Design a protein around this ligand. Structure first.
Ligand SMILES: *[B]([O])([O])[C]([N]C(=O)[C]C1=[C][C]=[C]S1)C1=[C]C(/[C]=[C]/C([O])=O)=[C][C]=[C]1
Length: 358
């Protein structure tokens, strides 16, 4: 790496790892569209396995960006429309609260207060149907944003229905394979387990548990190298040769709703660049990020704005991840850690690094 990149990264991350007690971390900086990698510490404390460029981390909700792009690709293929009623793809959702709830609302957390988590007791396809049938919206559709796995999770399940493929196969075939994300997995194969970091929660080694709509909302595992490649693909979709995929990436960065100075895309969230660091830093904090907030519709949605800080935080019980990029500066960052540490600390470090290089 250029010594400038080396120095800001180390000067920023070293203190972060110390303060937050992070066992292991990988960082990629995308600078003028070239990746630079950094790693520290342990993928597996017990077995003394270091973090490397090949280590798999749980992305947690950064997975929503893949779901949003896969959904965008389905739109581009003419398979679904964001204006379609939810019931078009799940006619068994007959409870009348679903009248007027579209794929758009599901994708963008504006259905009317779908819950943050799908309950644990929901397992089968029939459990899930009952869950959404019984759900009572707090609000009319398209009025309030409440970040929710059960909202975008369902968008992901329904978006792949016309394709005939499982969500995993659609993702593999239409997103991972075309982008050469060859070490990115919904289900980690046995052959790759050697590279799968442990998460650490209270110093216990943990991996994410199976859950309804897990793949769609929080179930991708990836390497810093693949995640650098994901960032490059989203920074410059016009370099992508697969037409519907290029378009899908563009659709996931359109601005559908605004709350405060934040705009909701499909999985990605966006602010105008230059951003006020306090606005993203404090904004990443969980009970701003996870709070009920009125939304203003963007009618019609603004296509991907190049001068944006585009980002997503993600967590599992044992991992904390963050991705942020600025299309107009060909600049981006990925931070993957096997501890779930506070979001503001993530955005703060990312901001310090990208501002220095911008
Ligand atoms: B995201 O990342 O946003 C998501 N994820 C999930 O769900 C996964 C998991 C499992 C276990 C735990 S997590 C979410 C997250 C949250 C939170 C976080 C913290 O706390 O950190 C919530 C919701 C969703």
């Amino acid at each position: 790496a250029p010594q400038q990149i080396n120095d800001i990264v180390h000067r920023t991350i070293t203190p972060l790892i110390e303060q937050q007690k992070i066992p292991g971390m990988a960082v990629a900086v995308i600078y003028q569209g070239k990746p630079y990698y950094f790693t520290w510490g342990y993928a597996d404390i017990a077995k003394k396995q270091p973090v490397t460029q090949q280590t798999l981390f749980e992305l947690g909700s950064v997975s929503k960006t893949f779901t949003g792009v896969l959904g965008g690709d389905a739109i581009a293929r003419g398979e679904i429309k964001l204006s379609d009623p939810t019931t078009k793809y799940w006619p068994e959702l007959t409870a009348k609260q679903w009248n007027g709830i579209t794929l758009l609302h599901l994708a963008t957390y504006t259905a009317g207060g779908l819950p943050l988590q799908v309950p644990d007791e929901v397992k089968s396809s029939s459990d899930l149907l009952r869950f959404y049938q019984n759900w009572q919206p707090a609000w009319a559709p398209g009025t309030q944003r409440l970040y929710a796995n059960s909202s975008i999770g369902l968008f992901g399940a329904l978006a792949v229905k016309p394709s005939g493929l499982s969500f995993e196969q659609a993702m593999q075939t239409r997103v991972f394979q075309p982008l050469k994300l060859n070490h990115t997995w919904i289900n980690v194969p046995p052959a790759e387990e050697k590279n799968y970091a442990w998460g650490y929660r209270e110093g216990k080694a943990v991996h994410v548990s199976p859950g309804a709509l897990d793949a769609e909302a929080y179930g991708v595992k990836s390497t810093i190298e693949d995640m650098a490649r994901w960032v490059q693909s989203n920074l410059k979709p016009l370099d992508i040769n697969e037409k519907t995929l290029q378009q899908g990436i563009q659709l996931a960065q359109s601005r559908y709703w605004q709350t405060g100075d934040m705009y909701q895309g499909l999985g990605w969230e966006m602010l105008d660049w230059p951003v006020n660091p306090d606005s993203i830093i404090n904004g990443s904090d969980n009970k701003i990020a996870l709070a009920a907030r009125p939304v203003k519709a963007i009618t019609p949605p603004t296509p991907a704005v190049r001068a944006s800080w585009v980002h997503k935080t993600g967590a599992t019980g044992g991992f904390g991840s963050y991705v942020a990029f600025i299309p107009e500066k060909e600049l981006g960052i990925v931070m993957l850690a096997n501890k779930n540490y506070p979001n503001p600390a993530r955005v703060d470090a990312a901001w310090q690094i990208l501002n220095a290089l911008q």
